[PDB]
Amino acid sequence: TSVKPIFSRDMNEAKRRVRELYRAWYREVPNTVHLFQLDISVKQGRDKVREMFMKNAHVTDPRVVDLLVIKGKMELEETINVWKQRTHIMRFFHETEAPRPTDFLSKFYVGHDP
């Protein structure tokens, strides 16, 4: 069944847009670190950008990829224009969340979580 495309037609142009967004985010990390006076390193910011990109690597639908890159562009323009504060940039890192146990024995000890 044919569906109306948002962008990119097939997957190749979607990957091209993903790479363009990745370049834009990669060239913005030093400026974000300098302006926001973050205590993190530039390497940490680049690694976090890489991690955020990688958690959607299993998407095989061009429209979903287009929406993902649209939202990425939105959250990048929020960072460039300093609409976000240091609060949100550090929210990307979950610095205050306690490490959730992942093994069966620890999950059994702590509570009733699956």
Partner: protein
């Protein structure tokens, strides 16, 4: 006299029916259905890609001068294939009337932006996107308007929990406001209020 019952306006009902037939005949390519509610409110259901032609006609036509966009919202009905329902309310000052145009869309289907017809459509479509995830193709500046910066998910969808997933507090260790998973001291108490006896026989659906 029946003081406890609202009076009815058959004249306005007939006028709205005639104008609905008029617009349906003028625009057969996009108009799918026309209805008139018993409280005299005309309603037109069109194809999603007919938004620009239908709105342009309803704005510029001599007999339909709907120069004002009253409101623009979305309705979420998860049981439908095209869950999102885009609703436009138009006001004609020349003829002192109101009309409603309804179209449908899903998560991955863009809707043509009507900013070229009505200027209020800019912020109305920004709010619709922010609250439902409906994307508008040719929007001059599409971004979040009401939600917090970096907020994930669209709150007004029916599948979004009432309290969300995250909450904010001040953490003294990091000397900044932090976002943590939501946790309520008292859980919201859900009430089942629907009576098991049918109230309005006029709206009874076939058993099927």
């Amino acid at each position: 006299t029946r003081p406890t019952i609202r009076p009815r306006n058959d004249v306005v009902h007939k006028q709205l029916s005639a104008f609905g037939q008029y617009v349906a005949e003028i625009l057969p390519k996009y108009v799918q259905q026309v209805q008139v509610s018993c409280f005299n409110e005309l309603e037109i259901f069109i194809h999603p890609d007919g938004v620009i032609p239908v709105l342009t006609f309803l704005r510029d036509h001599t007999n339909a001068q709907f120069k004002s966009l009253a409101d623009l919202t979305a309705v979420d009905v998860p049981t439908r294939q095209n869950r999102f329902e885009i609703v436009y309310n138009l006001l004609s000052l020349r003829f002192n009337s109101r009309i409603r145009v309804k179209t449908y869309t899903d998560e991955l289907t863009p809707i043509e932006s009507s900013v070229t017809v009505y200027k209020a459509a800019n912020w109305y479509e920004r709010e619709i996107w922010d609250m439902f995830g409906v994307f508008f193709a040719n929007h001059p500046d599409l971004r979040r308007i009401l939600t917090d910066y970096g907020f994930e998910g669209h709150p007004f969808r029916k599948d979004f929990p009432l309290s969300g997933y995250v909450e904010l507090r001040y953490d003294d260790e990091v000397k900044r406001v932090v976002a943590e998973p939501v946790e309520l001291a008292q859980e919201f108490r859900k009430f089942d209020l629907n009576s098991p006896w049918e109230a309005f026989p006029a709206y009874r659906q076939p058993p099927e």
